[PDB]
Amino acid sequence: AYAEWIAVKVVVSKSIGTVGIRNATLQWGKFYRYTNKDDEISTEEVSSMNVQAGSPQWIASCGRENASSGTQGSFDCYDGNTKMGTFSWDDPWKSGATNTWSFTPASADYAGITSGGNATGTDIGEVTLTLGRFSEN
């Protein structure tokens, strides 16, 4: 249902400049133009987004309307040709389960730090994903 939703704020550091959102996939639900759940966006369009440092953009997904299922999917983040990592989430419809989400870095050259999100809510809600390029101390 629409009540199961996540919205990911993609924050690109000046250490990267531009992040390509690629390889978006959904096991359940749809993508939508935040904040309007009726304005569906294709997986191809999400997978064409370029996010610029200083101007965050949102990737939002919800369950299909009136469906007894939630939203579950992923997208990849790229620095040019180089994979940075993958953001994934699971927001089930049935009660008695925990919502999950994560960024998994492809290497220690990049990090994606998350803040916010409801682990036990009907919805995950808003999660901020802050992406940067790093070197070992």
Domain boundaries, the chain: 1-137
The technique is: X-ray
Residue in 35, 134, 15, 21 with CA at minimum distance from that of residue 73: 21
Count how many Cα atoms sit within 13 Å of the Cα of residue 28 in the half-sphere of its side chain: 18
Q: Are strands 125-133 and 18-28 parallel, antiparallel or unpaired?
A: unpaired
Q: How far apart are CA 136 and CA 6, in angstroms?
A: 32
Count how many Cα atoms sit within 13 Å of the Cα of residue 88 in the half-sphere of its side chain: 6
C-alpha distances in angstroms, 21 versus 65, 97, 116, 119, 121?
A: 25, 29, 21, 25, 27
Distance in Å from the first CA to the final CA of the chain: 46
Place of tokens 């370029």: 50
Resolution limit, Å: 1.1
